[PDB]
Amino acid sequence: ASYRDKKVMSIGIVKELTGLSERQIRYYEKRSLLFPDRTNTGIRKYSFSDVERLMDIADRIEEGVQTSEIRTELAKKDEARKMKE
Amino acid sequence: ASYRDKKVMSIGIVKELTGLSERQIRYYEKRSLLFPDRTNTGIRKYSFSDVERLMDIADRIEEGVQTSEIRTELAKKDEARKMKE
DNA sequence: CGTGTAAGGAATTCTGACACG
DNA sequence: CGTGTAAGGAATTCTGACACG
Structure with missing residues (x-):
């Protein structure tokens, strides 16, 4: 849980872990x-x-x-998550 | 759990996360x-x-x-862990 | 014992560009 | 649209040494 975020x-x-290239990961x-998040030196940090x-x-x-459609779906899920809490 | 290891x-x-220096972490x-673990390029990788x-x-x-005493304690705990499983 | 530092080398990540389309 | 690559710069980690004790 805490480990996850x-x-x-x-x-x-x-x-x-994902099989995705850096290009894809940064693009998303x-x-x-x-x-x-970013270290103070500019390095991106990810959670599980x-x-x-x-x-x-x-x-x-x-x-x-398309990424735009995915962004809409993600927005709903994020909103939904804030509800189950 | 899986996230943890x-x-x-x-x-x-x-x-x-620990407040320990690299010196201390590598020494332990x-x-x-x-x-x-080590990436194929020599970089150490740690779990939670x-x-x-x-x-x-x-x-x-x-x-x-002393580290030697700690090593003994850790050995018992590791053995104990293998038992609760 | 346990831990600090300086020192160069190798490897990682970063951004913006050029490319295809 | 989404993703590949080349390109230099900055930052990270690595090992072995010198130091104190």
Whole structure:
């Protein structure tokens, strides 16, 4: 849970965990699909929940959904999550 | 659980999480107190369980226990863990 | 014993560009 | 649209040494 949301992995490990390239991972963030934190030196840090978020994103893109559509879906899920709490 | 044991953090994040220097973290490993994995390029990777292991180590060292004594205690705990499973 | 620092080398990540389309 | 690559710069980690004790 806390382990799941703590931003502690750099992009290289995420790449290995998701099978996504750095290009893809940074692009999804650029498309406001996820929000990694940044060390004070500019290095992006991801949590396990981010990794899972990235895999769901990749799956949707596989089924032919544009990032914009994915952003809408993600927004609903995020809102929904705030409800179950 | 799986999140807890997956080796995914590099030493910089561990330092920030434990408050230990790189010197201390690498030394404890050298004293066979923990076993981080290594990327194929030589970079040590730690899991959340490692981070907690490191904090317990630091606490024992605080109470004046030598690394050798800590290694014995850790060995028992590891053996005990294999029992509760 | 345990931990601090200086020192160069290797590896990682960063951004913006060029490319295809 | 989404993703690949080349390109230099900044930041990270690595090991072994010197230091105190």
